[PDB]
Design an enzyme around this catalytic site. Sequence first.
Site, PDB file in Angstrom:
ATOM      1  CD  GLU A 260      -2.539   0.815  -1.047  1.00  0.00           C
ATOM      2  OE1 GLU A 260      -3.217   1.520  -1.834  1.00  0.00           O
ATOM      3  OE2 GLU A 260      -1.329   1.023  -0.807  1.00  0.00           O
TER       4      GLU A 260
ATOM      5  CG  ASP B 197       7.522  -0.085  -4.811  1.00  0.00           C
ATOM      6  OD1 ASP B 197       8.307   0.219  -5.738  1.00  0.00           O
ATOM      7  OD2 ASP B 197       7.367   0.632  -3.796  1.00  0.00           O
TER       8      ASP B 197
ATOM      9  CG  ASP C  63      -2.371   2.412   2.485  1.00  0.00           C
ATOM     10  OD1 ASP C  63      -2.451   1.359   3.148  1.00  0.00           O
ATOM     11  OD2 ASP C  63      -1.329   2.753   1.881  1.00  0.00           O
TER      12      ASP C  63
ATOM     13  CD  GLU D   4       2.476  -0.211   0.563  1.00  0.00           C
ATOM     14  OE1 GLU D   4       1.534   0.367  -0.028  1.00  0.00           O
ATOM     15  OE2 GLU D   4       3.127   0.325   1.486  1.00  0.00           O
TER      16      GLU D   4
ATOM     17  CE  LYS E  18      -0.544   6.319   3.725  1.00  0.00           C
ATOM     18  NZ  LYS E  18      -0.182   5.112   2.926  1.00  0.00           N
TER      19      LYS E  18
ATOM     20  CG  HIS F 150       3.573   1.749  -2.939  1.00  0.00           C
ATOM     21  ND1 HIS F 150       4.928   1.598  -2.733  1.00  0.00           N
ATOM     22  CD2 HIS F 150       3.123   2.527  -1.927  1.00  0.00           C
ATOM     23  CE1 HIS F 150       5.280   2.255  -1.643  1.00  0.00           C
ATOM     24  NE2 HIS F 150       4.204   2.828  -1.135  1.00  0.00           N
TER      25      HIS F 150
HETATM   26 NA    NA Z   1      -0.314   0.336   1.832  1.00  0.00          NA
END
Ligand code: NA
Lengths: 357, 357
Positions: free
Chosen positions: B221, B270, B195, B247, B166, B297
Amino acid sequence: LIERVRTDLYRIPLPTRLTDSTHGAMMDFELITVRIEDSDGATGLGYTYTVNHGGAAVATMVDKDLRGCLLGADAEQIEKIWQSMWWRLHYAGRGGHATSAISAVDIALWDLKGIRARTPLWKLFGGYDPVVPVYAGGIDLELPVADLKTQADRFLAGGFRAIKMKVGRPDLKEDVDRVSALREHLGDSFPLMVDANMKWTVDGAIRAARALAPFDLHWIEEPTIPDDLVGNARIVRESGHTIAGGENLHTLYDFHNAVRAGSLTLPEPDVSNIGGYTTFRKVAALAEANNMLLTSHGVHDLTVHALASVPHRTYMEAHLHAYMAEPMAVTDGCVSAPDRPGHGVVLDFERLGRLAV
Amino acid sequence: LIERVRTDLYRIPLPTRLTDSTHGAMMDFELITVRIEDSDGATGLGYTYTVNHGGAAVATMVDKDLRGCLLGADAEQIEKIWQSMWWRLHYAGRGGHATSAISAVDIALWDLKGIRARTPLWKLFGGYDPVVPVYAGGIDLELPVADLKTQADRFLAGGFRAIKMKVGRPDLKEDVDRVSALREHLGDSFPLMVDANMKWTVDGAIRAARALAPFDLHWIEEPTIPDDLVGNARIVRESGHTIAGGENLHTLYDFHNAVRAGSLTLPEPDVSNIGGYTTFRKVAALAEANNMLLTSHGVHDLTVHALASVPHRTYMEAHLHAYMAEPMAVTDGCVSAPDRPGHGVVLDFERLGRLAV
Ligand code: NA
Ligand code: NA
């Protein structure tokens, strides 16, 4: 500080079986009310609705999800609360039923702010003109032409000087005869709009527009599904009509996309699903910037305050009055926003208790 | 014909330290399971989840609104049922939580079809290759650098050959030092992705990308919010990185918009919120048509069948296993879609019963 949040779900039955091209079978609609009480005992009212389905889901979002963003928070910080709610239901949300839940809360918070400030919302928002023009939104697709004219007579006797009827029948020929019938009935210069409720394909909408051109319709609403920016832009480019849309758009971004793509010429947000007065006013600013007028869909008793505070407003849809203390009367094609603190709407919750679900 | 529809909601507790830039600390994810039984006694399993809030609303939609589209309907007509569910929750919906409710049902319907055809879903869908490459998706934004590397070692020990971390800390400098430490730790040949979970502004995202360019990230992301097509397209044009997203997109139209505007270079649907396998495969078709790879995801246990049936799949996100019978093992950086009828997922409902809400 917010000390109490009461959520209630009611199933209000419709006096007549209303019908449109997409979900016609409407015998009743779900009403979700939200009452927010602050530490000084003042209570703000907000509400949203759905047609036939999703009511319990909306009520659940307010009661189980948003409640936690409200209790203990300062109700005077509406924008701060709005953002916290938007992010609270963002996962799997960012549009959808969550925006209706947010709208109900937002509306109650503004009501509360108006009450504390002892001023009606239209003045609190800035104040333009409390007299707002309206149009009767009929949900009459399956209504016999004869009764369509009768209904029109009732709208007229009721004070309306503009009427919207449904279109989107299986055979275009049927819409053409009905629009033709109502046009000659209402007269040449009478504002008459039509609502296809997303029934047509892009090609079908344009074909329908050509066939209805002779009747000088004030506007065609939701010719096809709203998700299709490209196709709607094409309908705008080739239909030769004002294209109204927005009751199914649920975020400021949806309206931004549509406006930027030129996929509609007249935005129609619904304060009860666009995010409340907070987001409604932002959509209004977008329309003003783009030299567009602004109309609306639903809950005109709440909506009147938003359109009374903007300069570019046009005919407001004025299709719960039986459960209201003092609903506005239509006079010479208009209604007047009340001057009581807040939005001035009072529901008879005792009487509504009977329809609680 | 469908004779039974069981919807259940579970509160699966999540350990502390699972955090990202915008959702904050994840206390638990609300699992909504749907079990559908047809007239022959065959049952299909489907599910979706939310993080922290909205679960009860999702379960309510399936149980109260969609149940009526299921009971008495022929489960074999998945596409017909999909459309009726989309329309049943269209007013105030057309995106949002209703799409997760829909996905759960859709997944159960496909599972049932696979069970009845006595074939694993990846083969039912067409069949490409059951061996799907994966990457470990950590929710480690607030995790200390030392622990970040530690977690990385555990992922490697687990068979992973690609890791995502992250980003989106208040100060870019922190993200840069962390990415640099992880790049150093793994070697510049190791696929490392980041992400931001919509944390950055458009300008901020471009600035971050310039700062991170030295580490050759496989992809960035969700640099900013998904609603901004224009801004995201600008990030694509200026960042010099693969831009993954999807996502938070919940309709085929959302993906259509993003792809058409070039607001992302790698779609990440997703299956649990995009509409189930039905919609997921349509999104995959858009990706293939646009010469793009396809990632995903969430719920890799279900998703494995989707990516095992498409030729342009790339690293699948992997990370509820405590409640599963035969979880796939990660070997040499991949997992293998099982050959059991349907999706092959089996949940311990006795154990889950303990977490029922
Ligand atoms: Na994300
Ligand atoms: Na409409």
